[PDB]
């Protein structure tokens, strides 16, 4: 069955950078897009970014231009470099995989589904 | 020299005769062609995906999702009956010919001209046209059949049908592989079916460019290019239809009691009780010999799932069928599936003096009755008790799957090793003339779009393009749009299509049908007071023939 | 962009309950809602797809519907374990971004 | 031939699709469906049929017993998921002499 | 004639096979070149001195000081792989061909067009373009290689790589002798390190001029120029790589105790104590025979001072090496010296829709392991007592010259009579194809910039220039700027490069590495939605071969 | 008897290639065991029409 794992969340000073990592197994990592979704303590959900198989990336305006997402298809691993962090970015981050195989620029990063991982916590303060 | 013309306009049709009742029908066509410079010199890969239309449950037949490469090159296509024959020549052909062979094909571009557009920038706008005698027109002839075959007749985009009107070439493009899933639905389905475009599989990618594949001739105003004669190998095409169906093959039963006086009610009779008759039947478990039950040599036509849509990697597509309804010649609204429908514009038959963007349409109904009438079909149990009880018959009014509007004729195919069927009839003027045979190991018996199919290979496509007329400001390393002097070309295209046909004979006492001008249709072949032309469709297989 | 949701909802044990989400033509009217459930402190798990189907192992209790610019989720045979926060999800076709709703808390009585 | 796209994208982006640009009941073209004016990629004429559908997992009985109705080719798009191999695509079982 | 085309466009890559497994590769390449008139009709002797950058102590590596002659001519250079092959052809060559030979090369300028520019000066700006039939394009072929050789692949200034994209020719310049002194320094050097520029020695002055050394053709709009077929004489080129190193040469040691179960930990053991072994070693005073201490036939590769800079009359430069660091396949960051780095713009691979001046870059990690991993070396005493002590081993971590960062490998050299090393792999697209051999009495064994090195001669550089279209106000005695009509030229260039390759053979049970398209690299080879193209680098030596 | 293919398109096509994943399917195991894994035969695409 599909399994995802995440790591890299930690308490960090404002500004600077932080780099998350999510790993996958049980499914053909190449054929599926990967997405990060975040939720602040007690608050609602907010999609962060997604990366289709070809290296094409998508971001939400709250991070567009600040974060950079990527993949390593040879290791079923996805990375999220979070540069220029601010206090508002304090949240829990989850790793997801869309239901329907998809690749290329015109490919919707996330439609419906994902075996969300346990997630990693991130806090920005000093 | 610049001032010397490089060719001759010619739009005559010559019917040269030969031995044994044959005739060479050599058709010449000539056009003036207008080619603007391409919107961009670059190839593009573009996706169309109308989720706005297909998301509405039940519109799954309206899927236009596809990937296409858009090229700077334009396609010149004369593969349509309207490009060669005017109504009169068609009248001669379909009234006097029995079978029609396609022999050769030729084309040449001559009298090239290039012009540049200058704008004055005066407060009231105005612009002046100057000749660019040193500019070039790019011409590429794909004789090796390396490029995708994109017949313009399908989208109603071949050269015009009027010799006295200018024409344009269709912008060229071709399909790029894509993946797509669309689960059908009905007004009333819950949620929203999966309607997704998965992308393009890398192993299927094929990107072509004219520059890397075909030799390109640069034609200045003093140059001309001729393709060279091409020789076909197509199967013969018959200009006669077949009226017999299974019910009319073989020897009729002897009518023991003929009528004695004439009258609409004075039918004949066979005179032998059906269970007591003599003959042959495949229904080996019953003695009844009837016109509906008696064995026949084979089967004409076939029933096919009508409005069946089959999905593959690229999404849904309708199942094609060879022929449509039988006996539906009376009403257009009863054409139903199979019988082709053409929707065309003013370059191809629509009343030219009309306005608006409603295409002019017709539905072709052939004279051949190799079709089916599903409301008259039925399936009944093997015991064959008669009259049949409700439980032993599947009438067309009995539902399948619970849907009251879907019956077994929709999911019922009768094609077999006994099926006999004819090729598709020529459609004048909008019908395609020839088509290329598929590169599959096993090949279809006929194509629905062209009466002639090409056994091995056949004529290459001709592509044109205005050479880049750069300004002094060109800079390759800039990522902006290239700066081009606004340049356009008018050139003369001339082609020769050579057919070989056999004249018809009269095997019967009666006169057969023929196409003729009549008061109800005379104005369709003459210009209007304001110069409006229209070309109406004409039937091909008017004459009848015996099948067996 | 964002999808509207009710703040909270209540239902008695064994009764049926309903939850609603609202959007626009470019998010719900084109792509249906997908409903998620989140237990206290755990990562959320999906309940109903936009396809209308449910993942393997999801109780038959849940079911979803869609109408125009809005969607709706229902629970039949409400149980004590169903007390959790719920979220609608769609895809804004214009921005090309997944849009999640404001969330709703269901109370079991 | 694809349909001419009367309006094309102006920037790179997953959402920057193209558009045929003409209302469907107003399109020029040729289709076999004689009782409609909608011309669409699903409904536009094609020369012939590539591949065919068969009553898959049909078992047919003769004098020697039931057998599976063989088909020429398998599913489309199954290359992305082994679980969808289904009929058509062969399955080989073999031993240490042969792999 | 003005109105007649003088050539034909052609890209087609034609494979023609011979007997005995050889194939001829004819690569046709055709472009549209765009040529503005030069900034000044005069040759210029110019000095660049980035004293400001190098005054910052420790920046000596960034020295850019030199003297050049700037010419009013432009160089048309087709000496790069991307000008001839698209990725598909490169795939076929590097997947099926084991070796490659340069055979012949030809080129021609044709369809010459010359236009002048006039500006209206109207309040809303506008400008018009006019042809000039009398205007001439000056073209010069340096068949005898009189002018200094200056391949443009080193500056990414060759002809572009897309047939559908026009290209500029590179403005031409060459080096003029200069004297330079630059004492190196470190952040912390007191005062200003000696940094001076002295000028030019009288005995090394060479002011080459095209007009006084090369015949010049004056091409009007109806003329053409053909260089003629040049035939190369280069040594053959290998599209395979050697994975063997000194540790993999010869007969491996017999394993008296082979493994008994599968697993990554189930290794074999030789079984014979190291000083009791049999065999041969160059260590004349020790009884150990080990896979490091055994005699091997010769040395593969060699160590060299890496990031070492050497100075001569003209100033400091980096010492070149044939191969780079070993083991870079595991981590790209460890490649560094030897493995070439290519920075290029949009004409030559960078995505054509990108903004800014930042160029695409890549380091080339060849497949051949003839390199070195200096952190794995050590030098120890001739006594050879083990386990070696600190006083007796020079480890790479040991400091040299009081420096933590510099160890002996930085100054270490092991080139000698026993060295065996390989030629440079081709780099598609940005690599240079052929390079002229030096005119020294003793010649380098290889060139690092091109796989093929000319033995006797190689094709003359093609120089182009717009003839001076003077106005009426010309005064040859004037010291002010000359007045010329703004002229530019569009001329089509067509080249033919002919190779001869040997098809590969299956020498092994296992398959070999091959270039292929995959879901990742897929869209690198197809245009974007707005037409953006990009050419990515592609390896050349995927097939392994047996060194010994 | 076989025919040698020709490059017909700008882009590379798919090929069978050894890689860090399939590597140990074409070499014997330490104790000397061999295997043959299935291989595709129609990687190169062709134009149907």
From TrEMBL, chain F:
Q: Report the subcellular localization.
A: Virion
Family membership noted in the UniProt record: Belongs to the parvoviridae capsid protein family.
* Protein name according to UniProt: Capsid protein 2
Identify the species of origin: Canine parvovirus type 2 (CPV-2)
Q: Which residues of the full protein are shown?
A: 536 to 584 of 584
């Amino acid at each position: 069955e599909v399994q995802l794992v995440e790591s890299g969340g930690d308490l960090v000073k404002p500004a600077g950078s932080l780099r998350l990592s999510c790993v996958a197994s049980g499914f053909t990592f190449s054929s599926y897009g990967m997405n990060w979704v975040r939720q602040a303590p007690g608050k609602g959900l907010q999609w962060v970014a997604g990366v289709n198989s070809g290296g094409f990336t998508g971001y939400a305006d709250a991070v567009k231009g600040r974060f950079t997402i990527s993949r390593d298809n040879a290791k079923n691993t996805v990375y999220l470099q979070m540069n220029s962090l601010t206090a508002e970015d304090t949240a829990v981050y989850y790793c997801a995989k869309d239901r329907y195989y998809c690749t290329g620029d015109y490919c919707f990063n996330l439609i419906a589904f994902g075996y969300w991982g346990q997630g990693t916590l991130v806090t920005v303060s000093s | 020299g610049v001032g010397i013309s490089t060719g001759t306009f010619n739009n005559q049709t010559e019917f040269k005769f030969l031995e044994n009742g044959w005739v060479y029908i050599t058709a010449n066509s000539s056009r003036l062609v207008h080619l603007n410079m391409p919107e961009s010199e670059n190839y593009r890969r573009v996706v169309v995906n109308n989720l706005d239309k297909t998301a509405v449950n039940g519109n799954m037949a309206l899927d236009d999702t596809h990937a296409e490469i858009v090229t700077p090159w334009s396609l010149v296509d004369a593969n349509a009956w309207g490009v060669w024959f005017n109504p009169g020549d068609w009248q001669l052909i379909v009234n006097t010919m029995s079978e029609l062979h396609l022999v050769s094909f030729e084309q040449e571009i001559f009298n090239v001209v290039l012009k540049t557009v200058s704008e004055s920038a005066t407060q009231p706008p105005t612009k002046v046209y100057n000749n660019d005698l040193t500019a070039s027109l790019m011409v590429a002839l794909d004789s090796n059949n390396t490029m995708p075959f994109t017949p313009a007749a399908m989208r109603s985009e071949t050269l015009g049908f009027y010799p006295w009107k200018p024409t344009i070439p269709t912008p060229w493009r071709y399909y790029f592989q894509w993946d797509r899933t669309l689960i059908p639905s009905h007004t009333g389905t819950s949620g929203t079916p999966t309607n997704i475009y998965h992308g393009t599989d890398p192993d299927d990618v094929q990107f072509y460019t004219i520059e890397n594949s075909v030799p390109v001739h640069l034609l200045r105003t003093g140059d001309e290019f001729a393709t060279g004669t091409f020789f076909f190998d197509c199967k013969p095409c018959r200009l006669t239809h077949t009226w017999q169906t299974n019910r009319a093959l073989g020897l009729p039963p002897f009518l023991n009691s003929l009528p004695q006086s004439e009258g609409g009610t004075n039918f004949g009779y066979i005179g032998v009780q059906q269970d007591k008759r003599r003959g042959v039947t495949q229904m080996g478990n019953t003695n009844y010999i009837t016109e509906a039950t008696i064995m026949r040599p084979a089967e004409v036509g076939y029933s096919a799932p009508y409005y069946s849509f089959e999905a593959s990697t690229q999404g849904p597509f309708k199942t094609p069928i060879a022929a449509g309804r039988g006996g539906a010649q009376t009403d257009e609204n009863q054409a139903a599936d199979g019988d082709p429908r053409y929707a065309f514009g003013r370059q191809h038959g629509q009343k030219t003096t009309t306005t608006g963007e409603t295409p002019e349409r017709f539905t072709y109904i052939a004279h051949q009755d190799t079709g089916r009438y599903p409301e008259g079909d039925w399936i009944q149990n093997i015991n064959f008790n008669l009259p049949v009880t409700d439980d032993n018959v599947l009438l067309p009014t009995d539902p399948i799957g619970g849907k009251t509007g879907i019956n077994y004729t929709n999911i019922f195919n009768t094609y077999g090793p006994l099926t006999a069927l004819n090729n598709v009839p020529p459609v004048y003027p909008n019908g395609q003339i020839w088509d290329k045979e598929f590169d599959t190991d096993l090949k279809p018996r006929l194509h629905v779009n062209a009466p002639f199919v090409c056994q091995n290979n056949c004529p290459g496509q001709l592509f044109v393009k205005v050479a880049p007329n750069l300004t002094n400001q060109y800079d390759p390393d800039a990522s902006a749009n290239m700066s081009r002097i606004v340049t356009y070309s008018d050139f003369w295209w001339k082609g020769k299509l050579v057919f070989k046909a056999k004249l018809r004979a009269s095997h019967t006492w009666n006169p057969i049908q023929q196409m003729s001008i009549n008061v109800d249709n005379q104005f369709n072949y003459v210009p209007s007071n304001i110069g409006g032309m229209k070309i109406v469709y004409e039937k091909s297989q008017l004459a009848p023939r015996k099948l067996y | 962009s964002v999808l509207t949701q009710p703040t909270s909802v209540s239902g008695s044990l064994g009764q049926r309950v309903t939850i609603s989400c609202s959007g626009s033509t470019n998010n719900i009217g084109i792509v249906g809602a997908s409903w998620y459930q989140q237990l206290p402190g755990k990562a959320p798990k999906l309940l109903v797809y936009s396809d209308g189907n449910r993942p393997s192992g999801v109780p038959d209790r849940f079911s979803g519907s869609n109408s125009g610019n809005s969607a709706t989720l229902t629970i039949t045979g409400l149980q004590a374990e169903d007390e959790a926060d719920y979220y609608c999800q769609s895809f804004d076709t214009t921005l090309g971004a997944a849009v999640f709703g404001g969330g709703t808390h269901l109370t079991v009585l």
